[model samples]
Target chain A: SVPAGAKCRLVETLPENMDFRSDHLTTFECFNEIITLAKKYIYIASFCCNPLSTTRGALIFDKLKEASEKGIKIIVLLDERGKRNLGELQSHCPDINFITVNIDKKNNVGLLLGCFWVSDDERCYVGNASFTGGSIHTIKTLGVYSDYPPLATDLRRRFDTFKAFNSAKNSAANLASAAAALPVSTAYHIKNPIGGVFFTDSPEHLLGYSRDLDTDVVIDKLKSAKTSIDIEHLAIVPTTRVDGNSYYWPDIYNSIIEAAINRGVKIRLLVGNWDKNDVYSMATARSLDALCVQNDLSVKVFTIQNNTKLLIVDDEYVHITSANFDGTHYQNHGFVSFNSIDKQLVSEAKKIFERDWVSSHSKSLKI
Target chain B: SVPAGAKCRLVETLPENMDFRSDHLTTFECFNEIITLAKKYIYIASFCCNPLSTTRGALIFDKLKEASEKGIKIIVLLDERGKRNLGELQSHCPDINFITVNIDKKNNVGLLLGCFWVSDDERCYVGNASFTGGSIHTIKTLGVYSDYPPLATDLRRRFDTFKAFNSAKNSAANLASAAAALPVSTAYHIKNPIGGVFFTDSPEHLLGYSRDLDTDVVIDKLKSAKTSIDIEHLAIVPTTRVDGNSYYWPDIYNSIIEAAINRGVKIRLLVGNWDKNDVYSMATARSLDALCVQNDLSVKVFTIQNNTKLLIVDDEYVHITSANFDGTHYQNHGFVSFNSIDKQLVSEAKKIFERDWVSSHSKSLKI
Candidate 1:
């Protein structure tokens, strides 16, 4: 049923033939389940994925390797410019399909395709998430599961499109083609029960809808929060503009978060860890975290167990798409999901956020 | 008679009738020769000047007092922004007619009106040259001496028009007024003969001219066998653009110098002492000087002088002009000059340069 303050209607019944569950779970257990349940194939796409210390579980590489050795086709895509340990991933699964996309370029075709993971034909989870320990557990994230073939096919096709076009040789051509092929149906036109529609940008959709909206509007909404505000994103720079052009919106977002906290609003800001591949984003994230501590605000960075992206705002607004809070997301190419609030969905998202918060470690304010 | 390769007529006239002279003998002996010789009231306009130093072998303040006492009705106008030591000037020349015109705005009206000193019935010399000791004696400068009544009348009329619109309270209004007043006939069109005109914003004039002309220009043009290039221009930036906006023509000029030197052409480069007021220009000059030295070429800097601007490119090319080698000249304001290659003129210019160089306590190149 539709939840209170939800603008959209909810389905009456769950599909009987569905094999995947759509329940929200916390950090450690969720990751454990995701890692264990993979049967035939497991694909992971992330801006960064460091494989050193396992915060909640043993080395993720070992598990992925075990799964791959057992005949699972493990495909991992990472940002070419960030801090993910490709060596570790390669050592674990020699036959793994690992690719890095240059997200810094304006016409990044790879980012246009999409970011997601498909566990064979049985289950598929898609969201704005990275495959790092911090991103997975600490940062607010939203993920959606479906056993429906139509959704799965669409996602797999997008993934294949990105994989094929991310190469430096044909990236420009692929980007132009993708831009021309953008679907008008994906345009944001949803009604929001509380206030605004959710916005996202996919790799295939160069113009991330959220980025087109005025940053001030987001700040105003966050600042006017009456109950709680949850933020999951990446990178928040100080005064300097991104790409020497656009002003750093994340800093404004951080300022609003601080203001909300000062005004007695429960504000939770979740960021990703220092991804080596995407150092610019990581640097921004680190800076934002520093700002959070300076203002005496409650902020956490979730180093994903692998790599993930998600944001469940107020447990009512569920953002289940791929869009990092980095400068590139706003200026370059990416996609996101703007889900309407539902009581059952909010409750489930809240549970997931709580679990991740409980399992994640906090960085000191001093540094 | 026009010398070969010279676009303008060549003349060797005595310093007695010239508008201004900077030769050692004239500078030390006949400092106030022009004012003393003036039959009518003297009108002087400059960017800045220190009245403590007088042309009449006395404090300029004393000269002004004496002139006022003699009923000479002496009038002096200086740029408010440029004349930082106005208090001192005021204290020294209390009896003299002194007024400062604030021309800090981007417009050219104040500058145009300031040209009235030359346009009035009195003899006039307009240039980048200042009345300071360093500018008069050390730097290369240009001025025109004309008994042409029509030009003088036209210039005076324009100056009066500008004075009516300029307000001390509003700098922006003054600038706007200046911009609005168009095409003053008294405005002189001077060209940097070697190649590009000195400019900051529009270097194309200088670069395009030099590239098209293929004229082999030399720096330190007046230095004898014992002395080399002793340039004291505002900036001597190497072949590089300034602020990523303006191009430095000297870089190309230096390349030609280097090429000539490589063919066994002897050369020396001297830069200004770049006082505290001109830090940006100084830094650029120093950087270019460093590049020349790095290439095993000879380049020296004189940064002790308060205000000086000159360039002597080979004994054959004596450039005595008011323009400094900076982005501002190339892009912003108007600067005119009287360039000559006459052996006598070159000799006179050299004598003045030698004294200034000696005062600078700088040495010639060992390389």
Candidate 2:
């Protein structure tokens, strides 16, 4: 077997021979450095943009505009469903090409696909990290930057395919076919790759997985929690009863919460307010709030307007996947989970978690 | 009309006859003060005890115990429902004589007529105020006291009659017949020599003929609302659908609130916790909380463990009737509306309103 550290090589500079850097620090540093050095163009494709203090802060937008003023072509491809406040960004950077990708209705069945950024023809950064603050700071995340021509070319091709699919002329079927050819687990599986089959409701797409694995995983994680567990999700809904019976999820969720509280574990839950569609979700928030007020265990529930799926435990292991904490993404259909372990990576993930906790709670990280 | 203030005299005295004082205060004062004082009772009749905060503060219990220790007779005749929390109170005050007055199935009609306290041989108090905080403070209420031997003796007879009914020794039919003969309004008017007619569900109790001028007087009051309106009740549900839907109160209440807000009139609403049966009342509280948050109005909803009916509009008029703010109370039942013009009495009512406003909203009030 390859040496443990050798398998995850750290680079001081953007790898000249690869399409993306495996090391997070190296990737971020290179991405930052390349934007400063880019002479011609910079392209960024993201699911959503929430210009809040917890996310990108004020300086990132300033730098993007600064790059635009220097005659660099700036193009942004954002998902249509999550582009509510896009006009605000457009108003500031009127010259930047703000393209909303209307992924074919069938292909866009799941929540968020992924995020990627290509800096001209020289380098590319792509991974599970969204453009939101919580994804970057609170979530166990990964991003890569590569300077190699062949890899950058392939990455750019993928970007072009996605762009084409988003464009008016292309059919959604063509986009789906191209997306099918793209490797599903390449983002987080760069180092220490794990063999886990993709599961989803749509047979045509390999991204979203079906089955109750997401719910099972959450229950397992909750059961396994010892001293502390940090749960950051887009939503948490209590089960509803049909006919004359009481629903399942609410009681299950409440029992889990009560068990965690009883065990004296410091449980921190962060939720995103995609839409308050689930009444039980609000009830859960309220129950958690009430528990926090009455009990010694520190519990919180909040909604990130633009949050992607993320769950971390004891800053040790994490599941960075595309499944939401709802039945639709779990029992019903369209769910995915990527179980990962990297002490260093987990540490970095902890930072993202801390960022989210702080932003939602309006307080600094306890640790 | 008897000399303006002669109808109901406003007399303030030292707490020598604390029970008498409390009873007197209950009638003349707003529901808030009466409840606050009742809450201070050292020994409370558990049967009459409704757990509404308007009547259930610790001070009320402490005062009752204080009186009980001083050799004052503290015989509590509580309803069957009131016995639910007797174990908790018994744990604290074992020496207090707590009696449960379980009304039979046949006599399970009207407000569970349970509250009656005799402070001394010459002084007594009686009304709908329950042992709960909400019953005393937020509910439209009244209590009367008399040093006159005749009234006190008659009140004792009614109290004994209730005691017999609760003991199951007396026939439920007999109690019901007695109740029908000595209806609350009739007893109230006869004992107090008040000009008010006793009107109830019975057709015999209905007013036969009224002057056309009386209708004008009622209409004029509705049109004269200017500055502020305060409504305190078990419920305030508007039945007539405005948008051809069942939930008509939303539009009517919202318009009244918006109109008040537009005119810069501070409106205050006090609602008793409607959920005496299950957790549904908590949901109601949350929905109302959301409404208050959305409207940015000064509105409060609280639960009185066993709240009686109460409603006061500004200090200009007070309605001390057994009418809940529900469709049935408005459309089906015979509910009385007493429009009082005594400014001193209104001012006293205002004081009670202020006390309740402080208690329910002390933590949440912006000011």
Candidate 3:
């Protein structure tokens, strides 16, 4: 119940309609701002740290090193399964301390957890990907940032609950307490002209619960779609049954898109040409085509090497964060949400998404 | 890894589907089992002890009274919000010790939490539903049960965390830190042949994370549809934008079903005829019809006075949990998963579903 009500700025420079005005809202960009403003400690976490090679991951690490060098203590944690990447990240560290606690081989039992990066113990970020898809930014990520204290404390405690306890991470009592702290019942109301901020908790983030929140929000907006649902995702997975511990990913992300299309909401699923998990990109493309033909709907699904994940409904609702379409990515990532609180931001977000939707990189399908 | 491997028998008698054999596999039913097997104590924590008049709520109270009267120590904890119901429950109590916890009002906000019912300190049920779905037994509920000591302990602590310090029920550090004690990660793999039991702490059980898990699992299985997707529930909400503890639901639920149809799977939706949430049920029927016609696919959607919530896929995967279509009922319910572990159970589930799918009470939709 810590009264956390601080906010931050939207990243990306806008130069008007450079097509649809690429709304370059980003996590790394926002993360950079948070860290730069950090005068104290930065507690960070992730399901998996992107390989040092990934653009976003590298920047994340570089930023951490920079922050640590600036006398800011950097504390990090991630899924034990992703421990290998930590060493690579440590190969070059500053005052950064990479911490990971395993309850027992019998407990962590192979579930890759999620992420949380709290800057200055106030500003918090959650969502997107295990890999930092910040720089490339087109990886249709979903996340939310908040200076809410309860959220910060909850995320922090989630980090500490798995904290190595006397060489034995006692995930019992502490974890229970956190579970008790979560809002058993919350209230989320969408604004009239399309704007609302709902800061709920994700107790089962380790179990990929972000989708439970993020996906619901996005889909709710889409359901209320009067004109369009413009999505710029890294991957459009509909055919493949991706596992949980994932993002706000749907069992079939494309199905909902098809449903929206069938709703006649000039939907454009600007699929990412960048393959994060193999040919699933194209496989999903086929699934999309199959869905269109199967539904007898002529959808304008395009294949674009885009990474931005933002949903704009009827040019009104604007959502941008770090949740990719995977349960793993959205559920546990240090992602957060940026919803409608401003009409200007809404207009800008829509314009940017529309530009990307009609961009040259976006390839259309004829199913 | 406390190898606390214990299982519960599915509720209801199964004599080879016996033509629409009702699967009363509910938490309350399963909970009834736990209490029947209860030798000494039964600890129940709920927002309210179930209003005195609700059929299932009354039955839940009656069951508790029956158990407590049978010399079982009944220790119950409920939110201050349900104090009146607790008083009603207390009016007819024996060895039952009714408890209510409340933090200073400035803190209680307007959130309605969920419940936990544990028996003999071994088997525990955690769900978002503070009360049963009444008669037909379907109220967007989400929950889980496990014999895992840590899980049991965590839930116990959750009960204890709100145990009302100084009789003021002020949830303090002993509370906040207690909330911190929740497990950072949990293991939820149930069975070997696609069966692994995972019972972790419930953070948003009161906020609808249960629906997230249940809905995701169902959709995940539906996405992998090579055969058929069969469902039986209280109501079918496809067209309604039901608001949740915080967001809107239905767009994705119906979209996934449409996706399954597009995938060419034999789909049958057994909806509840009883109108709980208004014309949303019929709206869903119309939406389903539109999806079939829109997808140019042939699918059967029925509306019945169904109370059960079950999903059978390919007659190979079986899912029986407490979740309905209404965003309120299922979104933050105490939903548990009964996934692909037993073929016989899967077979019975599908057969029973098909039977009910074509029953006299079930009405069909025309595309």
For each candidate, how many residue pairs have backbone atoms clashing (under 3 Å)? Answer: 70, 52, 84
The TM-score of chain B in candidate 3 is 0.65
- Show the lowest summed lDDT stretch of 10 residues, model 3 chain B: B202-211
Give lDDT tens digits, candidate 2, residues B127-243: 345555554444434433334434334345444434433544544424555544432323322114233221122111222222111222332433355666665555544332222
Give the Cα-based TM-score of candidate 3 against the true structure. 0.42
* Candidate 3 global CA lDDT score: 0.51
**iRMS, all models:** 19.6, 15.5, 11.9
| Model 1 chain B worst lDDT window (10 residues) | B194-203
Summarize candidate 1's per-residue lDDT along B1-367 as a digit string, tens digits.
3123231211111223223234232232222543555555666655566644534224444654676676776766665555577777677667665666543354442232132244235344443445555444443333434334443443343334333223365433354544444432332212332121111111122122222111222222331222234355544543223344323233334343333323323444555444444433444444344335423345555544423344555555455444455434434332334344556556655665565455434444322
RMSD (Å) of each candidate, 1 decimal: 14.3, 18.5, 18.3
Q: Model 3: per-residue lDDT, tens digit, B186-254?
A: 233332211333332222432122212444545566677786666666555533332222222554464
Task: By lDDT, rank the candidates, best first.
Answer: 3, 2, 1
Model 2 error, position B124 (Å): 66
Candidates 1 and 2 compared: the better one by DockQ is 1
Displacement of the residue A57 alpha carbon in candidate 2, Å: 8.3
Total backbone clashes of candidate 3, pairs 3 or more residues apart or in separate chains: 84
Please name the candidate that would achieve the greatest TM-score relative to the true structure.
3
> Tens digits of per-residue lDDT for model 1 on A1-367?
4224222211111112222133444434444455688777786665666544445323566677678788888887666755347777677569777777664364333344254556665445566445655444334445565444444443454455345435456543336655445432332323332223333334333333423232333444455555676655553432223433323333344444445434545666655555454433444444444435433346666444222344455555554445555444544554434354556666666665565455534332223
Q: Of the candidates numbered 1 and 2, which has the greater lDDT value? A: 2
Looking at model 3, give its docking quality level: incorrect
Residue runs of model 3 more than 4 Å from their true location after superposition: A1-367, B1-7, B12-33, B45-48, B51-63, B69-71, B77-84, B99-117, B122-168, B172-175, B184-187, B190-218, B235-251, B273-284, B294-306, B325-340
DockQ, Cα level, model 2: 0.01
